């Protein structure tokens, strides 16, 4: 039997995913401190999956930069080095500014079945796709 080869490694794949998940509902948290008695149960939960959608969608834009990073590594990469990029995009993207434009525009999403499916699902085996 043939294996197919994976086009990165899956503990590297769940660490960057782990970590960028982590760091986004880190942002999250400190945005529903101040606003979420205004918000419903189910607007709450549709933040979150709004955080791992947007992991999902934004995936490949992350890759071109973490290929980058190894790169310069000057060795071999590890499961810390993903580790480590993966909590850095986690802190860097500034997610409130698009919590903030969904409340006040009226444009949290209708909380759906398959967003609850995502939400319910370990960090590690949320879906990405490489471009």
Same mark, same amino acid.
């Given at each position: 039997?043939?294996?197919?080869?994976?086009?990165?490694? *899956?503990?590297?794949?769940?660490?960057? /995913?782990? #970590?960028?998940?982590?760091?986004?509902?880190? $942002?999250?948290?400190?945005?529903?401190?101040?606003? $979420? =008695? !205004?918000?419903? !149960?189910? #607007?709450? /939960?549709?933040?979150?999956?709004?955080?791992?959608?947007?992991? #999902?969608?934004?995936?490949?834009?992350?890759?071109?930069?973490?290929? *980058?990073?190894?790169?310069?590594?000057? =060795?071999?990469?590890?499961?810390?080095?993903? !580790?480590?990029?993966?909590?850095?995009?986690?802190?860097?993207?500034?997610?409130?500014?698009?919590?903030?434009?969904?409340?006040?525009?009226?444009?949290?999403?209708?909380?759906?079945?398959?967003?609850?499916?995502?939400?319910?699902?370990?960090?590690?085996?949320?879906?990405?796709?490489?471009?």
């Amino acid at each position: 039997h043939y294996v197919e080869p994976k086009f990165l490694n *899956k503990a590297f794949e769940v660490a960057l /995913k782990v #970590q960028i998940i982590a760091g986004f509902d880190r $942002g999250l948290v400190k945005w529903l401190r101040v606003h $979420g =008695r !205004t918000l419903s !149960t189910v #607007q709450k /939960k549709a933040l979150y999956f709004v955080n791992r959608r947007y992991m #999902q969608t934004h995936w490949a834009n992350y890759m071109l930069w973490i290929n *980058k990073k190894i790169d310069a590594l000057g =060795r071999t990469p590890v499961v810390g080095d993903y !580790t480590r990029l993966g909590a850095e995009i986690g802190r860097r993207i500034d997610m409130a500014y698009f919590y903030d434009f969904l409340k006040d525009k009226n444009m949290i999403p209708k909380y759906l079945p398959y967003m609850e499916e995502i939400n319910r699902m370990r960090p590690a085996d949320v879906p990405v796709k490489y471009m």
